[PDB]
Each structure stands twice: as C-alpha cells, then as structure tokens.
C-alpha cells in the first residue's frame, strides 16, 4: 500500500507516461473519468500507492512529469488515457536542447526547476507511505535530461532515502537515434553513477531486438515497444500493491540490491515474451517461463551472457504458485553451469511473491538479471565522447549558457570512476 510517484522526463518521459500508466490503470481498474470499475475489493484498499481521493470518490495520480516542448505532451493527452491526469503537473519548455544536454540545465530550466519544487513539495508532501519515486528520464533530451538531472540534484542531495529505478533511455551506439547523442550520454552514464539504486540499462536496440526475434511482429511501434520499455518492467513494483507469500516493497527491496553503493546494472526479461503463434505451444507456469529467460534472446538491457560475472541476482514472482520448483530449478541451473557463475556468491536473490497476476496472464514468472558485468557495452560509449572532446564539436554552443570548461572535464575524470570500480573484479 506504499506510495510511488512515477517520475519521468522527456519526449520519452511523457510517452513512457502512457504505457506504464496503461498497465497500472488496468491493474486497479481506472475508468477514463476516474470513478471505480474493478470488481474485487483488494484492488481498492492498496490503490493509494499512486492515486488520491477527491469528491465523489475520484482517483487521480500524483506523478511529476517533465517535457521538452509543448508539442509532445499533447499527443499522449489525446489518447485513451490522457483524460485521467490532472494537467497541472505537465511542465513545459519554450526551448529544448535538440539532442544536447544543458540548455534547460543552468539558465533556461532555472525557472522550471524552481516550479517543480513548488510541485514535488505540492504532491510529495504526504509521503507517509512513500518508499520511493520511480524516476526515469530520457538523456538525449534537454528538458528531460537537464531538469530530470535537476530533479536528481535538488532532491537526492537533500533526502537520500529513495529508490531510483531508471527506465532512462540510454541510446545504444550501433545505430544511434542521433549522431550527437554521445555527448549528453557521457554526462548521463556519469549521472547514473552517483545516485542510482536499482537500475537497468535500456538500450533501445535491446527493446528493438524483442519484437522480431522473440514476439514475431513485422511492424513494431514505440507505443508497441513501450509495453516492454516500462509496462512489463514495472512488475518489479508489485508486492507493495499486491500481497504474497514472501511480501516485498521497494525500500525493503533497496537494501538487498546495493553491495557497493555505485554499481547499478542489469539484464532482465519479463519472461512472458512469446508470440500469438507461439501462445498455442507454451504452458504458463512458474517453472517454464524463467527457464526461458536464461537464453541469449530475452534481454531488456545489455550483455550476451557468458560475458562476465554475476555479482548479484534478483527476482520477483507472481501468483499463488509452487514454492518448491522455484527453488528446485533455480539451483538446477545455478550449479550446473558452473563455468559462467562466479565463485564468491551464494544467496544473492530476493524471491518476492506477488498474489495478483498481471491481467490476462495465467501464470507469469518474472525475473530480473542483476549483474555488474555490463562493461562489454559500456567501454564503447566512453571511448566515443573523447572524439568530440578534443576537436570541440559544439563547445562554442556549450560555454555560452553559464558554462565553463571545468564542468565537462570533471565528467572525464569522474565518469571513469565507474570504469575504475570494475577495476577490482576484472
């Protein structure tokens, strides 16, 4: 019953503010006018994680969203679920960075960071139950990555209590969505270093490598991607909203997942990924789906497995399920493939149980692949900021908005600390 405020920022941030808020607005039965439509009465008591009362029993989410220009916040407003968000908390930007990092960081969003802290102190006032803000950004953006970092700045410097679950989209470097996206990536992978707690790597090819290779969709969409960008992967947050055998919660979850306070990188799979032509031939059980996660095809993040160490593992499961074959088949693949598995870790998981299955799914085994061994794709990004550093691609743009050359050379000697923190386990 413990509150989350689903923070999200950018043109991705207000679009990932559609499909996370489809599956949550389907889980608890949200009508387009707000008043209740669900049947069972366990759905109404736990619902005040997110929403808030009104007159007439209307529920309305408390969520801080940041967007870049007023032309992208509206294309999700005129959708099926845009009538439900009260529109004070869509903050807006006259000018964006256009695939850069700091236009709305120092001087243009200096008024936007002074108005959302008139907003987070206006709807995260009542944090009597709140364990964490799930905070996501988009780091090619300027108002979703400048203000989104100045949401990280003037909150997490005050209060260190929060879990920081990023679906923050790092654009992958094989076919990037922009040439200039490395520059605001190397401040961002650095901005993933200092504060993050439970954290995936979203590289958009690894979502793009799902619909063809696994789900058999000829013509995908970002709005078809967005069921997997967040909406399945907020089946991490389910135990606070639905009970189980071994109940969890994110602050409770946050204290098993952090060995060394920086390293933060995963490789998950929401293990239901089968086509409708491969829905005829799959048994929906808590053994079988997790045993389908283990392949080289099911990841939402980074790495091909056998390419590093398994420094932690995590898990959240669903439904009234079997307690034995969760722990029969997890160790049957832990200690059989003893080549990949690292020697010095016994019991790193936290098997949480969620009673209510995700809607329409018979039994949905879910699993998350924790690691720290994602550095087969995170040294390739950090060797491609230095191309624009030495020849100075846009610094004549960069230095004019209250910026020196000491800010972006800090992120040369301090992004490399995370490279210097796999220094112990190579």
């Amino acid at each position: 019953m413990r509150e989350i405020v689903h923070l999200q920022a950018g043109q991705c941030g207000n679009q990932i503010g559609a499909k996370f808020w489809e599956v949550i607005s389907d889980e608890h039965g949200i009508d387009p006018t707000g008043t209740y439509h669900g049947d069972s009465d366990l759905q109404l008591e736990r619902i005040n994680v997110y929403y808030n009362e009104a007159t007439g029993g209307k529920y309305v989410p408390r969520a801080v969203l940041v967007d870049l220009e007023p032309g992208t916040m509206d294309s999700v407003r005129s959708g099926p679920f845009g009538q439900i968000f009260r529109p004070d908390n869509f903050v807006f930007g006259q000018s964006g960075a256009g695939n850069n990092w700091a236009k709305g960081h120092y001087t243009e969003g200096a008024e936007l960071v002074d108005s959302v802290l008139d907003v987070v102190r206006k709807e995260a006032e009542s944090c009597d139950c709140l364990q964490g803000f799930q905070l996501t950004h988009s780091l090619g953006g300027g108002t979703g990555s400048g203000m989104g970092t100045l949401l990280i700045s003037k909150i997490r410097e005050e209060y260190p209590d929060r879990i920081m679950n990023t679906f923050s989209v790092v654009p992958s470097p094989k076919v990037s969505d922009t040439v200039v996206e490395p520059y605001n990536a190397t401040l961002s992978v650095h901005q993933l270093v200092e504060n993050t707690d439970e954290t995936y790597c979203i590289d958009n090819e690894a979502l793009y490598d799902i619909c063809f290779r696994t789900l058999k969709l000829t013509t995908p969409t970002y709005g078809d991607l967005n069921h997997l960008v967040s909406a399945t992967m907020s089946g991490v947050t389910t135990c606070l909203r639905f009970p189980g055998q071994l109940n969890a919660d994110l602050r409770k979850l946050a204290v098993n997942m952090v060995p060394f306070p920086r390293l933060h990188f995963f490789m998950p799979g929401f293990a239901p990924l089968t086509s409708r032509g491969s829905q005829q031939y799959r048994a929906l059980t808590v053994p079988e789906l997790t045993q389908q996660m283990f392949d080289a095809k099911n990841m939402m993040a980074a790495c091909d497995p056998r390419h590093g160490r398994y420094l932690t593992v995590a898990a959240v499961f669903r439904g009234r399920m079997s307690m034995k074959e969760v722990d029969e088949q997890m160790l049957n693949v832990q200690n059989k493939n003893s080549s990949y598995f690292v020697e010095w870790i016994p019991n790193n998981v936290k098997t949480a149980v969620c009673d209510i299955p995700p809607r329409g799914l018979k039994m949905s085994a879910t699993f998350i692949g924790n690691s720290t061994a994602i550095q087969e794709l995170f040294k390739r990004i950090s060797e491609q900021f230095t191309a624009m550093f030495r020849r100075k691609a846009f610094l004549h743009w960069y230095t004019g908005e209250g910026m020196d050359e000491m800010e972006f050379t800090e992120a040369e000697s301090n992004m490399n600390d995370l490279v210097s923190e796999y220094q112990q386990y190579q």
């Binding site: 019953m1 413990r2 366990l42 736990r46 009597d128 139950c129 364990q131 606070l240 009970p243 055998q245 071994l246 109940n247 919660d249 602050r251 409770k252 946050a254 204290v255 098993n256 952090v258 060995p259 060394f260 306070p261 420094l311 399920m321 079997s322 307690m323 034995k324 074959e325 969760v326 722990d327 029969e328 997890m330 160790l331 200690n335 010095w344 870790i345 016994p346 019991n347 790193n348 998981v349 936290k350 098997t351 149980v353």
Partner: protein, 427 residues
C-alpha cells in the same frame, strides 16, 4: 490447563500459524465468534481470545488473515503492525525497529501474560531466511530474557537446506541469528525443507507438492511438542521437562525429529503400525527432519514425547532396544538421560492435511552430533564470502560493523570447539 503464548513471524511463521492456530482451533471447539482450555482467558461475554505476542513489519502481512476465515477469532489490538517498514536484513531489521515496534509492545505484553494460570513458556517459530523470520527474533528474545526470568522459549526453525537457500541474503543474517540464540537458549529445532519435499515425494505419494503441505506438518510438530500441557495427564510433562532435559549446555541445542505423522492417508494408512515399527522408522536415516545422516555423529540424549495409543510397556521396550542399538552411535558419558511424556489422542486429521486415520502416533525427538557437517558447510560459505568485502554497505549502514562479523566468526569457531569437545572422548 497449563498456559503459553505463541509467536508466528515471517512467511514461514505465519503459514505455520495458519496451520498451528487452525489445529488449536479444531482440537478445541473454537468457532469464529468466540463461543463453541490452555491458552486464553474469557470475558464478561465469555469467549476465546488467544493471548498473543506477534511481531510483523510489512504492509500486507496478516491483512490476509484479517480478511480470512478466522477474522473475529483474533482480537486485533494484540496483533502488531506499524506505519513504517523495516527493510529486510539482519542490520536494518535490528536497528530501525528498536524505537518503533518492540518498545511500545513492551507495554502491550501486560495483558497477554498475567491472567494465564501456569505461566509456562512461549513457543517461537522462526526461519533462517531473512530479516523478519530470523532478524526480528533477536530484539524479541532480549526483551524476553531481560524481563521474564526462567521461562522456556522454544525455537522451531527452518534450516537453510544444504544446497538451496532463498530469501534476503542468508549467511550474514544467519551468523548473528545463532549469535542471537547464544543469548537465550532453551531448545531449538530446525527443519531442512528439502527432506520434507522428498518425503513428500516418496512416503506421501505427492507428485508436484506445493507451499501448503510443509506448514501443517510443522503444526503437528508443535502439537505433539507442547500439547502435553493441553491434554490429559498420565505421565504429564511440560516444556520445563523438555528444555532442561534435552541439552545440557547453552552451546549445542539443535535436535531433529521425524514423527509417525510424516506418512500420508493414501499410502501409509495401508501399513500396520506398532510402537517398535514406528520407532524403527524414527531412527532410520532417510526420513530425518534436517538432511544430516544420523550415523555420522554421536546420539547425545533422545528426549521423547508421546501421542497415539502408546503403552508404558512397549515404549520402554523400544527405548531399551534403541539404547542397545550400536549402529546408532551413542555418546560416551551415558547411554541414559531420556524423558517421556504421555497423551492419548489418535491421528484424525485437520482439513488440508494429507495424513491418515491410524490409531497411533509417536514423536521422535533426538539430539545428535551428526549435523556439524552442515554447520561447517555454512561456516565455510561465510568465510568463503566475507574476505572480499561483498555486501558490505547495507549491513554496515545501520549497525553491523566489519569487526562485528569477524567477532561473530570467532565466536562460532569456539562453538565448533564446543561441538568437538562434546562429541569426543575424555579421560
């Protein structure tokens, strides 16, 4: 008429509580509003209100109990949840609660103990999994020690099965879980869950077993453990004759127990039962409650409770023959040193239990040295781990320092010295 208070903590504890209070409320006529011997007191209306130290931190712990069938059976002020959560480890579970949940209930323990007649013991169920089942016992046990005196507090346990173990990360919890049972010691059973899953496979004919079947069995454990204060007295013994009589020193208090109720209605209602065949099946190695082979150690002193249609002739005949049996490697200092205690109710089961209607039961309870293999396995895993400084931060943030795991390591090395000194001969 002798009285007690019970404790069900964590998932293992509370589904054992579903089971254990279900069998209390079926072996007495307890119906869900109160009006139809040994655990309660009545009112002006006059109705069964179970006395109750429970402790639970979570959002939705026993709200399923509150929504469940037995919802007006338990009076709600005595059952404890807060507004905030203790995040689960030994560290955080130890050190953000000691102002919050155990210290306003040190005033609540007022009502639940005084009007019991024979204030005899407490029954605590814990699991070695995580920062609720294991780590919330410690705060509690030092409260019980510093305010109660010489009452018994019997620990029922899950042992982390010697290959598979899943909760919030187990060993750094487990080392101070037994450095907690150093402080207050009466008698502490464990169960390996894997031996339960395999006796469920083979003795019971249960293919694909589930979560339910373990906890009803732990209910039959606590039934034949401490219903001798509850049923008729022929040779009436208590937990005062259980904790004094199993284990001598506060160093080793770790027994094991395979019942006549480990066998199902579909399969072993067929088999003929007698006291000798049951106690033979007790002292056989396959059916043990923790997966340690009993032959690889010294039987210290078996202290028996009895159910079923027993007779003082044949139980003493089986006691004598077992004491003669030398494949049962007995201890050097004395073959004797037992205890027996009597009840007379034959097994006819609770709903949701798969066992039979036979006329008999026998409760094996035995201490052996044969589990130091599993203890050295767990100590091997902890000192395999800690020297690389893995999982430092969220154990050391709230109170469990680096030198405190190492003092816990050397305390437990001295406890393995106690293992070998109890086991081995002396002149």
């Amino acid at each position: 008429m002798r009285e007690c208070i019970s404790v069900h903590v964590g998932q293992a504890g509370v589904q054992i509580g579903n089971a254990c209070w279900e069998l209390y409320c079926l072996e007495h006529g307890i119906q869900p509003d109160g009006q139809m011997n040994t655990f309660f007191s009545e009112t002006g209306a006059g109705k069964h209100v179970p006395r109750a130290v429970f402790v639970d931190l979570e959002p939705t712990v026993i709200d399923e109990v509150r929504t469940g069938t037995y919802r007006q059976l338990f009076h709600p002020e005595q059952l404890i949840t807060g507004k905030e959560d203790a995040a689960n480890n030994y560290a955080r579970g130890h050190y953000t609660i000691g102002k919050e949940l155990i210290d306003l209930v040190l005033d609540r323990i007022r009502k639940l103990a005084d009007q019991c007649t024979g204030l005899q013991g407490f029954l605590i169920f814990h699991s070695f999994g995580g920062g609720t089942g294991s780590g919330f016992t410690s705060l509690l046990m030092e409260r019980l020690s510093v305010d109660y005196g010489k009452k018994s507090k019997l620990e029922f346990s899950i042992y982390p099965a010697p290959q598979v173990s899943t909760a919030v990360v187990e060993p750094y919890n487990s080392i101070l879980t037994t450095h907690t049972t150093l402080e207050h010691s009466d008698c502490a059973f464990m169960v390996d869950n894997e031996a339960i899953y395999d006796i469920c496979r083979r003795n019971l004919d249960i293919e694909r077993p589930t979560y339910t079947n373990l906890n009803r069995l732990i209910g039959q454990i606590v039934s034949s453990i401490t219903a001798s204060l509850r049923f008729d007295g022929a040779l009436n013994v208590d937990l005062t004759e259980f904790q004094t009589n199993l284990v001598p020193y506060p160093r080793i208090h770790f027994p094991l127990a395979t019942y006549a109720p480990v066998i199902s209605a579909e399969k072993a209602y067929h088999e003929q039962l007698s006291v000798a065949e049951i106690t033979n099946a007790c002292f056989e190695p396959a059916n043990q409650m923790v997966k340690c082979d009993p032959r690889h150690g010294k039987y210290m002193a078996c202290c028996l409770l009895y159910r079923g249609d027993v007779v003082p002739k044949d139980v003493n005949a089986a006691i004598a023959t077992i004491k003669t049996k030398r494949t049962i490697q007995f201890v050097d200092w004395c073959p004797t040193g037992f205890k027996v205690g009597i009840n007379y109710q034959p097994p006819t089961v609770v709903p949701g239990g798969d066992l039979a209607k036979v006329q008999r039961a026998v409760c094996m309870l035995s201490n052996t040295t044969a589990i130091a293999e599993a203890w050295a396995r767990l100590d091997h895993k902890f000192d395999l781990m800690y020297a690389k400084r893995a999982f430092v931060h969220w154990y050391v943030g709230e109170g469990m320092e680096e030198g405190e795991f190492s003092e816990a390591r050397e305390d437990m090395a001295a406890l393995e010295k106690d293992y070998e000194e109890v086991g081995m001969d002396s002149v």
